[PDB]
Amino acid sequence: HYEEGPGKNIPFSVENKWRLLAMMTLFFGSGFAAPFFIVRHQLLKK
Amino acid sequence: HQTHAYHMVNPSPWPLTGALSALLMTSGLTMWFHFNSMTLLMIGLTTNMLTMYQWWRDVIRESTFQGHHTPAVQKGLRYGMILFIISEVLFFTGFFWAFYHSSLAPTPELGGCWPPTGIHPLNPLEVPLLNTSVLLASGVSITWAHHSLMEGDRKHMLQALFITITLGVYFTLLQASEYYEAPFTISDGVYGSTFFVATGFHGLHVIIGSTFLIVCFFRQLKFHFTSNHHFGFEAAAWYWHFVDVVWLFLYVSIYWWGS
Amino acid sequence: KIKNYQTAPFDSRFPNQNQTRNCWQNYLDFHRCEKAMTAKGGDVSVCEWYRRVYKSLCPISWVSTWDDRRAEGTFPGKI
Amino acid sequence: KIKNYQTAPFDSRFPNQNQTRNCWQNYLDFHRCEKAMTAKGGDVSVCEWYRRVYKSLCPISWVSTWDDRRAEGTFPGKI
Amino acid sequence: ASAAKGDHGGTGARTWRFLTFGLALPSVALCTLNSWLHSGHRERPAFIPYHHLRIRTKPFSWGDGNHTFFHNPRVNPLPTGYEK
Amino acid sequence: FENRVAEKQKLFQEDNGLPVHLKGGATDNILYRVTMTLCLGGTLYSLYCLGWASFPHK
Amino acid sequence: MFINRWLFSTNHKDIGTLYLLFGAWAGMVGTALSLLIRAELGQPGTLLGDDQIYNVVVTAHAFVMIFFMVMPIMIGGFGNWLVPLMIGAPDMAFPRMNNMSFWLLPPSFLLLLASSMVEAGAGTGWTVYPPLAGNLAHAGASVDLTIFSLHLAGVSSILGAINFITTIINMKPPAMSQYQTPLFVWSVMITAVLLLLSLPVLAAGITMLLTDRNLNTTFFDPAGGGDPILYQHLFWFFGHPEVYILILPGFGMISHIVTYYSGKKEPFGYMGMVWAMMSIGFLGFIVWAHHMFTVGMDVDTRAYFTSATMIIAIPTGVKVFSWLATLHGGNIKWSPAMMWALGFIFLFTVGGLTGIVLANSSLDIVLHDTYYVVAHFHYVLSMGAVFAIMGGFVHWFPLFSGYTLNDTWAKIHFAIMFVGVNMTFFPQHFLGLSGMPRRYSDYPDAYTMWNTISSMGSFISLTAVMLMVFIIWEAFASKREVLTVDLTTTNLEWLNGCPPPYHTFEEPTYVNLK
Amino acid sequence: MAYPMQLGFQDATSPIMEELLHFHDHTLMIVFLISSLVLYIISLMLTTKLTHTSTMDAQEVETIWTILPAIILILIALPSLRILYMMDEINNPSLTVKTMGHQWYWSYEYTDYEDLSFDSYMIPTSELKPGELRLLEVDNRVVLPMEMTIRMLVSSEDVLHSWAVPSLGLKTDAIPGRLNQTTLMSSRPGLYYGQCSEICGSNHSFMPIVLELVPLKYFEKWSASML
Numbered sequence A: 001h002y003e004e005g006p007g008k009n010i011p012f013s014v015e016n017k018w019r020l021l022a023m024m025t026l027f028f029g030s031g032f033a034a035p036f037f038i039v040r041h042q043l044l045k046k
Numbered sequence B: 001h002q003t004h005a006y007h008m009v010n011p012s013p014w015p016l017t018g019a020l021s022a023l024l025m026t027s028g029l030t031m032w033f034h035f036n037s038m039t040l041l042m043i044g045l046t047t048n049m050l051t052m053y054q055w056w057r058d059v060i061r062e063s064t065f066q067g068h069h070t071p072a073v074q075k076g077l078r079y080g081m082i083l084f085i086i087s088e089v090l091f092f093t094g095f096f097w098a099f100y101h102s103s104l105a106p107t108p109e110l111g112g113c114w115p116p117t118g119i120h121p122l123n124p125l126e127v128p129l130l131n132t133s134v135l136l137a138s139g140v141s142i143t144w145a146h147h148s149l150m151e152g153d154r155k156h157m158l159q160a161l162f163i164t165i166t167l168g169v170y171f172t173l174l175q176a177s178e179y180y181e182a183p184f185t186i187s188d189g190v191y192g193s194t195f196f197v198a199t200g201f202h203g204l205h206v207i208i209g210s211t212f213l214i215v216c217f218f219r220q221l222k223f224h225f226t227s228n229h230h231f232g233f234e235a236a237a238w239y240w241h242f243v244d245v246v247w248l249f250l251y252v253s254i255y256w257w258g259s
Numbered sequence C, D: 001k002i003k004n005y006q007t008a009p010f011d012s013r014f015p016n017q018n019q020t021r022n023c024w025q026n027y028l029d030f031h032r033c034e035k036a037m038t039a040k041g042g043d044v045s046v047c048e049w050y051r052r053v054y055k056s057l058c059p060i061s062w063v064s065t066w067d068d069r070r071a072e073g074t075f076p077g078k079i
Numbered sequence E: 001a002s003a004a005k006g007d008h009g010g011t012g013a014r015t016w017r018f019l020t021f022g023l024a025l026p027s028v029a030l031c032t033l034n035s036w037l038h039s040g041h042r043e044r045p046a047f048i049p050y051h052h053l054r055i056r057t058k059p060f061s062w063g064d065g066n067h068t069f070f071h072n073p074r075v076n077p078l079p080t081g082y083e084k
Numbered sequence F: 001f002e003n004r005v006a007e008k009q010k011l012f013q014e015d016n017g018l019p020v021h022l023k024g025g026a027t028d029n030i031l032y033r034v035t036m037t038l039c040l041g042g043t044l045y046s047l048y049c050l051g052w053a054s055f056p057h058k
Numbered sequence G: 001m002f003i004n005r006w007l008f009s010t011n012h013k014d015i016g017t018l019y020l021l022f023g024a025w026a027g028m029v030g031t032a033l034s035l036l037i038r039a040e041l042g043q044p045g046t047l048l049g050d051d052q053i054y055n056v057v058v059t060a061h062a063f064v065m066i067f068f069m070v071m072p073i074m075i076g077g078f079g080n081w082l083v084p085l086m087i088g089a090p091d092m093a094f095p096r097m098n099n100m101s102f103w104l105l106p107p108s109f110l111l112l113l114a115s116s117m118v119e120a121g122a123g124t125g126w127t128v129y130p131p132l133a134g135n136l137a138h139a140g141a142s143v144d145l146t147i148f149s150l151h152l153a154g155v156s157s158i159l160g161a162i163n164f165i166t167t168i169i170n171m172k173p174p175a176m177s178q179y180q181t182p183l184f185v186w187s188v189m190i191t192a193v194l195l196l197l198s199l200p201v202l203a204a205g206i207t208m209l210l211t212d213r214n215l216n217t218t219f220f221d222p223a224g225g226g227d228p229i230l231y232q233h234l235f236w237f238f239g240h241p242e243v244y245i246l247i248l249p250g251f252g253m254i255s256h257i258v259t260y261y262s263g264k265k266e267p268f269g270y271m272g273m274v275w276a277m278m279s280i281g282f283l284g285f286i287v288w289a290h291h292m293f294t295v296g297m298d299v300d301t302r303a304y305f306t307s308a309t310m311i312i313a314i315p316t317g318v319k320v321f322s323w324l325a326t327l328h329g330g331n332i333k334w335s336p337a338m339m340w341a342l343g344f345i346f347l348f349t350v351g352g353l354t355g356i357v358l359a360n361s362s363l364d365i366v367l368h369d370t371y372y373v374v375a376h377f378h379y380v381l382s383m384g385a386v387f388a389i390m391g392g393f394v395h396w397f398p399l400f401s402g403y404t405l406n407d408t409w410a411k412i413h414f415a416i417m418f419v420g421v422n423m424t425f426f427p428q429h430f431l432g433l434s435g436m437p438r439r440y441s442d443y444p445d446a447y448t449m450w451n452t453i454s455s456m457g458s459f460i461s462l463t464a465v466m467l468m469v470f471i472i473w474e475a476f477a478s479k480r481e482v483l484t485v486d487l488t489t490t491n492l493e494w495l496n497g498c499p500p501p502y503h504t505f506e507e508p509t510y511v512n513l514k
Numbered sequence H: 001m002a003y004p005m006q007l008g009f010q011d012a013t014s015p016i017m018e019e020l021l022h023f024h025d026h027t028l029m030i031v032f033l034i035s036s037l038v039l040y041i042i043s044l045m046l047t048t049k050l051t052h053t054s055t056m057d058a059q060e061v062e063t064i065w066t067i068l069p070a071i072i073l074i075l076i077a078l079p080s081l082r083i084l085y086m087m088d089e090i091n092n093p094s095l096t097v098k099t100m101g102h103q104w105y106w107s108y109e110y111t112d113y114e115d116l117s118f119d120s121y122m123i124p125t126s127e128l129k130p131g132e133l134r135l136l137e138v139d140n141r142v143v144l145p146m147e148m149t150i151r152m153l154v155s156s157e158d159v160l161h162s163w164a165v166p167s168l169g170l171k172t173d174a175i176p177g178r179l180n181q182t183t184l185m186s187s188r189p190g191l192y193y194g195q196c197s198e199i200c201g202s203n204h205s206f207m208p209i210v211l212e213l214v215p216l217k218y219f220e221k222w223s224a225s226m227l
């Protein structure tokens, strides 16, 4: 069986709030950054 | 322990393999259409077949072998199949809409008439009529198969089901031959477009339907069905009637009225 | 003669925003009439009205394409 | 001119035993043509073929009734 | 409608089998007779390069890109006409 | 043919803690590993194809 | 154990969590795209390039916000999490198929990203109209990857619809009739019915565009006797129901939030609310041509579509007044969720009203394809749908996670967002009335002031989005565990604690028939 | 054209656009009234310590909020449909002009008598003469006779485009293989601008429409000289 309770019903860990901040930063940051880099990609092709 | 009658399904990998196989097939179609390669498509079709095979195998294991299909579970599966068929009906509706739109207001490029100038339609009284008698006949034989199963008659259920399948195959072979013989092609304007895409998707459904019936035939051979519990057969029969009704609309609309 | 045409008048047969058929019809009519007159020994001046109307309504590229096709033998319409 | 007519030839548009529309169509065609020619300043001789065909096919009483009705203003066909 | 036969006292397996062999299959046999009679290759019409037919906006992803999937040499002309 | 459903019922109800998709035996394992390998490998390959198509080959 | 739980899930809660995560990520992508749009229009001139790269951005912004953010969050996230709990069900009818609806989304999203990576992207508008979207004006794989993305998202939603309808009809307690289920459950079922009926038509239509592009069919090509307008009919037949699919679950959550924070045990006029959602769902299938008032249709067809479209204001009006009537006499709790709901009621009404202005085919001649339309839909989507999602998120976050957010920070988040979206979209009404066209990378000089103010408002919204990420972090970082929740007698989803155990309702609820 | 900081519609140049302005004023008042009424009621519900949390009956007040909106919708539909039908009235034009959309410019054809036709491209910003409008000027304007009923036929030779002139209340999609009709009638002489209103690719933002309305006499001379 699986772990249950606050902080245990999720695919990411919230054991360390700083490691968590790193996770969330990469997660949400990669999403927000993607369009900018795709725009850069399109501009650097021609 | 649970005190409800519903099915708590074991964690399964098939939803993921199925989703990935969808990515491989669409990626694959793109590679084929634009980068002249069928590698991705081949892998996609293979993992798709493997996913469906294992997923449905597990459903049989959960029901026939483990007894998880209580009346409540079976009731839900009934709604599920009816809903699926409804969405299939709406899919075809889009193709019929395209057909009527084009045929009721023939544009000047067609000669302002329907069928377009240069198009020589198949005779609806020849193979298309035969195809119609074939599917209607299979609708009768599958009903005999259903009653035989309910009456606990194994031999006649198998016999009727075999006849139903043979008829579906006959239709498929006839259609394949008609496709080859047709003087018009999919590239012959909107007439060929509507004709081949609509009858083509219908032919695909006949193949899917026949396969479903074949699965039932072998599950029957293996004594999976009881005279009272045989949802797989019921679903296959509902799907088969759907395929039959879509053909009747195609026959009347495209082959007859549209000629 | 019974002319003095400004532009193609309202035609009750084609009263809506889509005027595609109006152009098509008149183009057909002119070429059918022109063929009948050139054949039976008569004058194409009777086909004038249709010529003026289709000329007024039909995009130049349409008329040009249709003309090219009638010459090529690939015009889909009946003339 | 282009004639030397014996009788109305086979017409692929009316290949069946019921020939009612063949007569009607040619009667309409002649009177439509005759109206177009007498109008735009031309000659009715171009309409000859239709006249010969309908005269050959149409019962005298039908032509007679239709003629009376065109005169009376009660002809239901479009001319 | 009501057809032209009768039963209805109880539509069961025997009845549906009766319909399968007494009505359905015979119908299929007749239509199979009719079809494998009115067949015979009808003479292919003269080719006319109509612009609304033999469409080619992008080559097909198979063969030489100019032949339809179920191309029949005998009855399907290419945009340039029938084949040799 | 003879009715062997009871044998299959015994096998699939055997308390061995295996999920239904692997409860049939060693073959289930193989088929699963084949399926998953083709899926993940095929996905990696599609990513590679995307990378290739993303750039012009002038 | 990690893989079995998160990749092989057959649990409605975990699957709902995956959807919420996916939708949150998609929201960041959609926000970035909206920033690129407003950066390009922030001052006269060209920033990124011509209309192609600009419209590839506009097109992706729409697809991401609609298909990857709103639908996954509302239906897949809140739907999966709450529906089973609200009817006391042990899980969804098809728990395994439910997992596939989720897993089809990442591949679908990958195809969308692929389409913008290859060639020059698909700069067609989210409506993907041919011939611009055809193989001559948009040669290459881009548009084909876009169509495939829609196919996968389509299959995901259709299977999801089948699962929700079956669960809602078949898995309520024996004594509970359909007229005893919460309004959110009603909103999800109706939404599922709209999805089941509309997506297959879209699928038919985009498949025909695919064949026109790759198999030489000519459904939309006049050269073969086709018609570009046929595509529009097929698209919009799905397109209008789609906008109601985007707002219905929102209406459902608003009913729960307004009732809850008004300290009421029930929403005002329950049966009228059910009637209203059903009517809206029905009417939503017979008004599609209002997206085609300038294509050249007969005047009678246009008079019909104008009339049919306005009727929806009646049932929608019943819902608005019922929400106000639920607030009436309440012991109002000014929580952050309530704020989002109150903003929704007002802002959605404004957006709906401008929709009624657009319903008039006469006026629409001048407003069509201008920023007046963009203003209308962003009030109902970026304020309506989004506020419902934010309200539901702050209200149920404690339930899903077991932790509480900081209310003050959440109220600050609401204030910033409220200013941002209004500053962004209100001026767009002026731009529309005055004639600024949609899908333009640059505009005539006269439109400069309003475009400048609109782009500044979009930056304020960005600040709100960044703050929200921090707020969620702070909740998980501090770990304030939930103890008690009020009104559980009329909010069954909270009755199993926060978060509820993996398996809930193993022993079903007891409900007498009397 | 639109001017800096404009809030509403461009001034009406045709009788029909005038008609739309009054219909919009009528509709907008209702929009303001309903939206402010809703905002007011929200504030009213939220500003009292008095409570009533027991079950409230609804089959009474729902008659009010069903009949009222129904009446209001009819009050909007009546003038809306009157205008709709008015735009469809048979008017019998004195001139027919065709316009074909292209990627990315418009071509015009005046083929009633002579076979006159020309392309109309946007003047590049680098090329504007002092005082000219950026993105709005074209090399060849659509010269038309003022105070006359003109039939405009719109189509396209490639992708979809849309021919619009806001000051005249016009917007007709340009669809390949289709000939859409609209009628134009300017109450005044002058220059009237519009822009392509259907996404058509790379230069969708840069293919404007400029109408030049002059008296019949000048229209004729211009006709001749443009041979």
Ligand SMILES: CCCCCCCCCCCCCCCCCC(=O)OCC(COC(=O)CCCCCCCCCCCCCCCCC)OC(=O)CCCCCCCCCCCCCCCCC
Pocket: G350, G354, G422, G423, G426, G427, G429, G430, G433, G453, H007, H008, H009, H028, H031, H032, H035, H036, H039
């Ligand atoms: C941000 C830029 C602002 C620029 C302002 C105008 C400058 C005028 C100079 C100088 C002014 C005088 C000289 C010019 C007169 C031109 C008359 C004209 O041609 O007339 C037509 C024009 C102009 O209309 C006007 O006559 C302007 C009306 C402005 C109403 C503003 C409500 C604003 C609320 C909060 C501030 C805005 C942001 C939040 C908005 C939140 C949603 C409303 O075009 C419109 O129709 C624009 C509006 C479209 C429809 C929106 C409908 C629902 C809106 C609000 C309901 C609020 C109810 C509660 C009461 C309000 C509660 C908050």
Ligand code: HEA
Pocket: G020, G023, G024, G026, G027, G028, G030, G031, G034, G035, G037, G038, G058, G059, G061, G062, G063, G065, G066, G069, G070, G073, G124, G125, G126, G127, G374, G378, G381, G382, G385, G386, G389, G390, G393, G421, G424, G437, G438, G439, G440, G441, G458, G461, G462, G465
């Ligand atoms: C749901 C739909 C949605 C949403 C929310 C938005 C939001 C925004 N949109 Fe819009 N937009 C569309 C759908 C949407 N849009 C569509 C359909 C089009 C038409 C496309 C076409 O023409 O083809 C369009 C077009 C469009 C244009 C017109 C482009 C043109 O015609 O040239 C502009 C211009 O300013 C614009 C701007 C913005 C901005 C600044 C926002 C900002 O308000 C965004 C602010 C950020 C958010 C509101 C996201 C927050 C949500 C989350 C991050 C989830 C959080 C996670 C949890 C709570 C779990 N959008």
Ligand code: HEA
Pocket: G127, G243, G244, G246, G247, G290, G291, G309, G310, G312, G313, G314, G316, G317, G318, G320, G348, G349, G350, G351, G352, G353, G355, G356, G358, G359, G360, G364, G367, G368, G369, G373, G376, G377, G380, G381, G384, G385, H034, H038, H068, H069, H070, H072, H073
């Ligand atoms: C959440 C999404 C959503 C919702 C719910 C709606 C709701 C409505 N929409 Fe909107 N609409 C869109 C999303 C949405 N729309 C999008 C995305 C587009 C553009 C697509 C594109 O081109 O890309 C669009 C486009 C659009 C057009 C096409 C305009 C054009 O392209 O030229 C029209 C036309 O009629 C329209 C009308 C309406 C109407 C009448 C409603 C009605 O449902 C609103 C009813 C609500 C009210 C009226 C307010 C509450 C009522 C009261 C307080 C009662 C009293 C009121 C009266 C008496 C009037 N919409």
Ligand SMILES: CCCCC/C=C\C/C=C\C/C=C\C/C=C\CCCC(=O)O[C@H](COC(=O)CCCCCCCCCCCCCCCCC)COP(=O)(O)OCCN
Pocket: B172, B175, B176, B179, B180, B181, B182, B183, B184, B185, B186, B187, B196, B197, B199, B200, B201, B203, B204, E068, E069, E070, E071, E072, E076, G151, G152, G154, G155, G203, G207, G210, G211, G215
């Ligand atoms: C024997 C009868 C049964 C029909 C199907 C059997 C074999 C064909 C292979 C797959 C067909 C499946 C669905 C139909 C899709 C396109 C129409 C095909 C119907 C067909 O087979 O039409 C043929 C064209 O083949 C063509 O291009 C076909 C080219 C094959 C490539 C398939 C293209 C794949 C596109 C699929 C889109 C998938 C999207 C579906 C989404 C579903 C909902 C999300 C007709 O042949 P022809 O030579 O033009 O004329 C005959 C002249 N003698």
Ligand SMILES: CCCCC/C=C\C/C=C\C/C=C\C/C=C\CCCC(=O)O[C@H](COC(=O)CCCCCCCCCCCCCCCCC)COP(=O)(O)OCCN
Pocket: B075, B078, B079, B082, B083, B085, B089, B092, B093, B096, B238, B241, B242, B243, B245, B246, B249, G165, G193, G282
């Ligand atoms: C020109 C166009 C061309 C294209 C046309 C193409 C094809 C034509 C169309 C159709 C023909 C095809 C196949 C027909 C054959 C079999 C279908 C199966 C039906 C069947 O056999 O149904 C049975 C009974 O009826 C039941 O389901 C009854 C219960 C049904 C439940 C599912 C429905 C729920 C979905 C939403 C509800 C709608 C609400 C209506 C009110 C709305 C008001 C506006 C099975 O039982 P069950 O589910 O346990 O229900 C228990 C109730 N006795």
Ligand SMILES: CCCCC/C=C/C/C=C\CCCCCCCC(=O)O[C@H](COC(=O)CCCCCCCCCCCCCCC)COP(=O)(O)OCC[N+](C)(C)C
Pocket: G321, G324, G325, G328, H041, H055, H056, H057, H058, H061, H064, H065, H068, H069
């Ligand atoms: C286009 C826009 C349209 C504009 C909208 C117009 C809004 C309508 C305006 C007024 C509605 C008038 C309703 C009158 C109801 C009387 C209220 C009352 O007082 O509420 C109850 C009645 O129950 C009941 O109807 C149940 C309680 C009240 C039921 C109605 C209250 C809801 C009213 C709406 C709330 C505001 C939202 C307005 C929406 C715009 C009280 O019960 P009793 O006195 O028997 O028991 C108390 C015991 N005694 C006997 C000792 C006193």
Ligand SMILES: CCCCCC/C=C\CCCCCCCCCC(=O)O[C@H](COC(=O)CCCCCCCCCCCCCCC)COP(=O)(O)OC[C@@H](O)CO
Pocket: B089, B093, B097, B100, B101, B102, B104, B105, C016, C018, C020, C021, G298
């Ligand atoms: C259905 C019960 C409700 C009853 C309400 C009626 C609503 C729809 C049914 C009516 C359809 C037949 C009407 C055709 C008669 C007109 C002939 C015609 O010509 O209409 C044509 C299109 O019709 C077409 O495809 C029509 C194509 C169909 C579009 C309708 C969409 C609804 C389908 C979804 C419903 C799912 C049902 C599930 C099936 C069991 C073309 O359009 P025109 O504007 O003429 O263009 C010609 C111009 O050159 C001149 O202006």
Ligand SMILES: CCCCCC/C=C\CCCCCCCCCC(=O)O[C@H](COC(=O)CCCCCCCCCCCCCCC)COP(=O)(O)OC[C@@H](O)CO
Pocket: B056, B057, B059, B060, B063, B064, B069, B077, B081, B207, B208, B209, B211, B212, B215, B224, B225, B226, B229, B230, B231, B232, B233, B235
């Ligand atoms: C060349 C051929 C390849 C082409 C691709 C597709 C190929 C084959 C598709 C054929 C479908 C096969 C389905 C087999 C399902 C077997 C499992 C089954 O039928 O499972 C049954 C449940 O029904 C269930 O889940 C019902 C399951 C519903 C499945 C029906 C779905 C059809 C799939 C269509 C997919 C394509 C869509 C169209 C594309 C545009 C098990 O319950 P019972 O029967 O009551 O047994 C219990 C008793 O024994 C107790 O005593």
Ligand SMILES: CCCCCC/C=C\CCCCCCCCCC(=O)O[C@H](COC(=O)CCCCCCCCCCCCCCC)COP(=O)(O)OC[C@@H](O)CO
Pocket: B007, B009, B018, B019, B021, B022, B025, B026, B048, B051, B052, B055, B058, B059, B062, B063, B068, B073, B077, B080, B081, B084, B087, B088, B091, G093, G094, G095, G096, G097, G098, G148, G151, G152, G155, G158, G162, G200, G203
């Ligand atoms: C360009 C090409 C695009 C290609 C996209 C392809 C997308 C996916 C491809 C791979 C998917 C195939 C894998 C098999 C799926 C079977 C689902 C199924 O059979 O699901 C069943 C439920 O749906 C039911 O019955 C009834 C519903 C049956 C649905 C069958 C699934 C077919 C998927 C295609 C749908 C197309 C949509 C049609 C409309 C256009 C069973 O439910 P489970 O939760 O499993 O178990 C519950 C247990 O109690 C059973 O004992």
Ligand SMILES: CCCCCCCCCCO[C@H]1O[C@H](CO)[C@@H](O[C@H]2O[C@@H](CO)[C@@H](O)[C@H](O)[C@@H]2O)[C@@H](O)[C@H]1O
Pocket: B025, B029, B038, E061, E062, E063
């Ligand atoms: C929603 C369900 C639908 C899913 C998608 C349907 C997938 C359809 C697959 C079609 O695949 C094929 O592709 C080919 C093209 O490569 C063929 O080979 C051929 O193509 C060639 C390659 O150029 C030639 O060498 C040969 O002659 C030959 O005909 C071919 O037989 C066929 O199998």
Ligand SMILES: C[C@H](CCC(=O)O)[C@H]1CC[C@@H]2[C@H]3[C@H](O)C[C@@H]4C[C@@H](O)CC[C@]4(C)[C@@H]3C[C@@H](O)[C@@]21C
Pocket: B154, B155, B156, B158, B159, B162, B221, F001, F002
């Ligand atoms: C073997 C089995 C009898 C029952 C049993 O398995 O004990 C018999 C009875 C009826 C079945 C047959 C049916 O009569 C229908 C078919 C008729 C034949 O022409 C070919 C095989 C055929 C497809 C079947 C094969 C046969 O082996 C079956 C399966």
Ligand SMILES: C[C@H](CCC(=O)O)[C@H]1CC[C@H]2[C@@H]3[C@H](O)C[C@@H]4C[C@H](O)CC[C@]4(C)[C@H]3C[C@H](O)[C@]12C
Pocket: B097, B101, G230, G233, G289, G300, G301, G304, G305
């Ligand atoms: C828009 C659609 C045609 C789509 C197409 O061209 O493919 C057509 C088909 C049938 C039409 C409807 C039917 O002809 C019945 C009605 C006729 C009235 O004159 C207008 C509304 C009316 C309700 C029509 C509206 C609209 O023009 C419909 C719905």
Ligand SMILES: C[C@H](CCC(=O)O)[C@H]1CC[C@H]2[C@@H]3[C@H](O)C[C@@H]4C[C@H](O)CC[C@]4(C)[C@H]3C[C@H](O)[C@]12C
Pocket: G271, G272, G275, G318, H059, H060, H062, H063, H064, H066
């Ligand atoms: C009859 C039905 C359910 C009542 C119940 O069983 O509780 C109720 C629910 C909502 C009601 C409708 C809504 O209140 C909206 C409308 C209100 C008007 O007062 C009468 C008609 C009106 C259209 C109502 C008719 C009828 O009383 C409905 C449809």
Ligand code: CUA
Pocket: H101, H102, H104, H160, H161, H162, H196, H197, H198, H199, H200, H201, H203, H204, H205, H207
């Ligand atoms: Cu031309 Cu936009």
Ligand SMILES: [Cu+2]
Pocket: G239, G240, G243, G287, G288, G290, G291
């Ligand atoms: Cu709509």
Ligand SMILES: [Mg+2]
Pocket: G294, G368, G369, H162, H197, H198
């Ligand atoms: Mg448009």
